[PDB]
């Protein structure tokens, strides 16, 4: 049987709050090492890669390696029924068509048991050439979210450009045009440029990603010429949440 117990249930709540809007269906890969997930939106414009190492769990067991197809909308709803300090436990049989979620209230007197149904899914194989670390940006996750929200009012897309003055985000609309410039001096925002890069992206998806903001204090942006953008959030020494995004033209 599979059994994964997590003390900080907030993490799982936060995870699905991030995915549900970006992705509806997804397959959960389980192993002796931990929990992983990988799926692309219907438009294949974006890809998600989740990693949750077993060592992060208070109690972990996985006899047989699994691949659980799931409705993330249906699954996020169940996690609404969880509190931010409920110990969450996931449970399933070696041959599972259902997934069991158990929330333990900290009051030590309330225990919820939700059991959801799985779906048969067509998984995708990939496919990735490893990044040229042409331009990399470490900065507060909130600030990134703010930036994406601001320019979302201006236009439908953003132009990101690197230099050693720093990195720059630009949007344009019938209203006007706006440019936010970021410079390094800490320490905190950090810009490591090896080459000047310049690409365009859709703000819609960036605004989806930023709902993963609560997971990390910082966000990382790996950018390379004519290859998809990478947006990474670390998950408290438990793993990482990685967003891939395809540019335009």
């Amino acid at each position: 049987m599979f059994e994964a117990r997590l003390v900080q249930g907030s993490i799982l709540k936060k995870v699905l709050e991030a995915l549900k809007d970006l992705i509806n269906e997804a397959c959960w890969d389980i192993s002796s090492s931990g929990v992983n997930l990988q799926s692309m939106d219907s438009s294949h414009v974006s890809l998600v890669q989740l990693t949750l190492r077993s060592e992060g769990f208070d109690t972990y067991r996985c006899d047989r390696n699994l691949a659980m197809g799931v409705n993330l909308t249906s699954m996020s709803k169940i996690l609404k029924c969880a509190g931010n300090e409920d110990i969450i436990t996931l449970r399933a049989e070696d041959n599972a068509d259902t997934l069991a979620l158990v929330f333990e209230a900290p009051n030590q007197e309330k225990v919820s048991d939700y059991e959801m149904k799985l779906m048969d899914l067509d998984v995708e194989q990939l496919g990735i050439p490893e990044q040229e670390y042409s331009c990399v940006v470490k900065m507060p996750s909130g600030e990134f979210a703010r930036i994406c929200r601001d320019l979302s009012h201006i236009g439908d897309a953003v132009v990101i450009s690197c230099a050693k003055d720093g990195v720059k985000f630009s949007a344009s609309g019938e209203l006007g045009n706006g440019n936010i410039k970021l410079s390094q001096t800490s320490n905190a925002v950090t810009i490591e440029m090896n080459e000047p890069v310049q690409l365009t992206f859709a703000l819609r998806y960036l605004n989806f990603f930023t709902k993963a903001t609560p997971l990390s204090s910082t966000v990382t942006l790996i950018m390379s010429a004519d290859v998809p953008l990478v947006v990474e959030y670390k998950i408290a020494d438990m793993g990482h949440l990685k967003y891939y995004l395809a540019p335009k033209i």
């Binding site: 194989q125 050439p129 891939y244 395809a246």
Partner: peptide
């Protein structure tokens, strides 16, 4: 000008 898809950059099969 036109939104790209990851299949154009990554190798996708299923």
């Amino acid at each position: 000008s036109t939104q790209g898809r990851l299949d154009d950059f990554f190798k996708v099969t299923g």
